[PDB]
Amino acid sequence: FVNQHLCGSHLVEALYLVCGERGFFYTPK
Amino acid sequence: GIVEQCCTSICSLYQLENYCN
Helix, strand, coil share of chain B (percent; to 5): 50, 5, 50
Other Cβ atoms less than 10 A from the Cβ of B6: the count is 24
Kindly tell me the burial class for residue B21, based on how many C-beta atoms sit within 10 Å of its own C-beta (0-12, 13-18, 19 or more): exposed
* Window B:1-21, CB contacts with A under 8 Å: 1-3, 6-13, 16-17, 19-21
- Resolution of this model in Å is 1.4
CA neighbor of B1 nearest in space, from A11, A21, A4: A11
Cα separations in angstroms, A3 against B14, B15:
10, 10
What experimental approach yielded this model?
Answer: X-ray
Coil, helix or strand at residue B6: helix
